[PDB]
Amino acid sequence: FVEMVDNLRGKSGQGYYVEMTVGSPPQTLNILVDTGSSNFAVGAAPHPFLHRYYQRQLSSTYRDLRKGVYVPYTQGKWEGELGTDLVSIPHGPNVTVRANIAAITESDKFFINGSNWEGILGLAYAEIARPDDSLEPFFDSLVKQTHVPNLFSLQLCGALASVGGSMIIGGIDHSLYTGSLWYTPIRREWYYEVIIVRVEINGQDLKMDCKEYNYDKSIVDSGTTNLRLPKKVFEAAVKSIKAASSTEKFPDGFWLGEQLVCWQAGTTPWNIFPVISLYLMGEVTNQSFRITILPQQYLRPVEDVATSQDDCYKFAISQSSTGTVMGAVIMEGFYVVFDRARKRIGFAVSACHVHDEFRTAAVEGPFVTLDMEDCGYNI
């Protein structure tokens, strides 16, 4: 899959995108890779922030579904006209498939002023597709119409500075990680839902009822920047992180994401900030494994601070009302295999993760963990 290595680009905090083509003749677009949604939606009108957009009038293979859909998010929205067309991934498998496309005709707070992507590739399952689960997601169409294997892997490489990485479509590139992959079940095929069974800060268990870690769900989401934690879990984690880093004091607003903290260039005290370990449900009864990230993952650089000359950072762990979200803060530490065929997600140490001479991100197992099924939330 050497053809697909390094096929992701982006700017810090603006997402990771892959090049795709739509229509006949092919129209090239940059598309955000989002494992947290399930629609393929592209700009189709000249929004001023867009480098380019889908022009259905130029595509002889465009087919109109005579249906629209309005997609609101917590902050933002897009509305689109549904259709199908031929889609390919130039630095992906050598195939072309007919896929659903939402031609975005109005939006608010969706496209990013200054970004270099024009659409979104929702890689999750049909249950959360908009308007309903009859709108087949792109990857489902890809696997159904071709011999591409039913899995993909993501290496997101962090540190506006340019980011990169690889989306290996239909397989795994073993050069992108070290050590072994460790797999956790996909609890249910809607989001990429997983179950966290234990949380440690610098090896110190938070000792909460593990149900709190997954209230009301835990997901793997390449389309979210932060590690988002349920409120109660966030409180305990911040308390422990504060205690571990107490040799230096920071305003309450920093831990709440309400202000940055800046240090003189090259003087960030990485060593005073703890590592964070999430134990995930393993493949075997009573067996778990843990993934461990560094402050280099969860203290993110903010480069566009005009009013400062120093190196400023955002605390990128935040509280959530929709459950745990393992966003870029987690994924930038690891090579992540979305093994749809076996309903499991694999983690391994990423060969491109950011670290220092004293600590590295880690994936370790096996551990003995009992009552892991009780950790999952049910209504």
Tell me which residues touch ligand EJ7 (CB under 6 A): 13-15, 32, 34, 36-37, 73, 76, 110, 120, 221, 223-225, 328
Cβ 324 to ligand EJ7 shortest distance, Å = 13
Alpha-carbon distance of 237 to 209, in angstroms, equals 14
Angle made by CA atoms 61, 29, 153, in degrees to the nearest 5 = 100
Cβ 207 to ligand EJ7 shortest distance, Å = 30
Cβ 259 to ligand EJ7 shortest distance, Å = 20
Cβ 36 to ligand EJ7 shortest distance, Å = 3
Strand partners, 144: none
Q: How far is CA 28 from CA 3, 16, 37, 56, 89, in A?
A: 18, 16, 22, 13, 9
Nearer to ligand EJ7, 68 or 76 (CB): 76
Burial of 52 (0-12, 13-18, 19+ CB in 10 A): middle
Nearer to ligand EJ7, 76 or 114 (CB): 76
Nearer to ligand EJ7, 27 or 297 (CB): 297
Cβ 25 to ligand EJ7 shortest distance, Å = 28
Nearer to ligand EJ7, 13 or 83 (CB): 13
Nearer to ligand EJ7, 123 or 181 (CB): 123
Max CA pair span of the chain = 65
Structure tokens at 304: 């566009």
Q: Which residues are catalytic?
A: 34, 221
Burial of 278 (0-12, 13-18, 19+ CB in 10 A): buried
Q: What are the backbone dihedrals phi and psi of residue 41, each rounded to the nearest 5 degrees, phi first?
A: -130, 130
Closest CA to 337 of 123, 91, 142: 123
